[PDB]
Swiss-Prot record:
This is Omega-conotoxin MVIIA. Omega-conotoxins act at presynaptic membranes, they bind and block voltage-gated calcium channels. This toxin blocks Cav2.2/CACNA1B calcium channels (IC(50)=0.67-208 nM). It acts by neutralizing the outer electronegativity and sterically hindering the ion access path to the entrance of the channel selectivity filter. It also shows antiproliferative effects on different glioma cell lines (M059J, U-138MG and U-251MG). In vivo, is lethal to fish. In vivo, injection into mammals induces adverse effects, such as tremor, diminution of spontaneous locomotor activity and bad coordinated locomotion. Expressed by the venom duct. One of its GO terms (cellular component) is host cell presynaptic membrane. The modification Cysteine amide is found at C25. The keyword Signal applies. It is found in: Secreted. One of its GO terms (molecular function) is toxin activity. The chain holds residues 46 to 70 of 71 of the full protein. Changing M12A: In omega-4; 2.11-fold decrease in inhibition of Cav2.2/CACNA1B and decrease in efficacy to kill goldfish (LD(50) is 1.80 mg/kg by intramuscular injection).
Length: 26
């Protein structure tokens, strides 16, 4: 996963916190 605030993609839940937030994990 990525650290909340890490550029993510369309939507593939790759955050360590939750989901994407405006293109940034969160």
């Amino acid at each position: 996963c990525k650290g909340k605030g890490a550029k993510c993609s369309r939507l593939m839940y790759d955050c360590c916190t939750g989901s994407c937030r405006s293109g940034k994990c969160g």
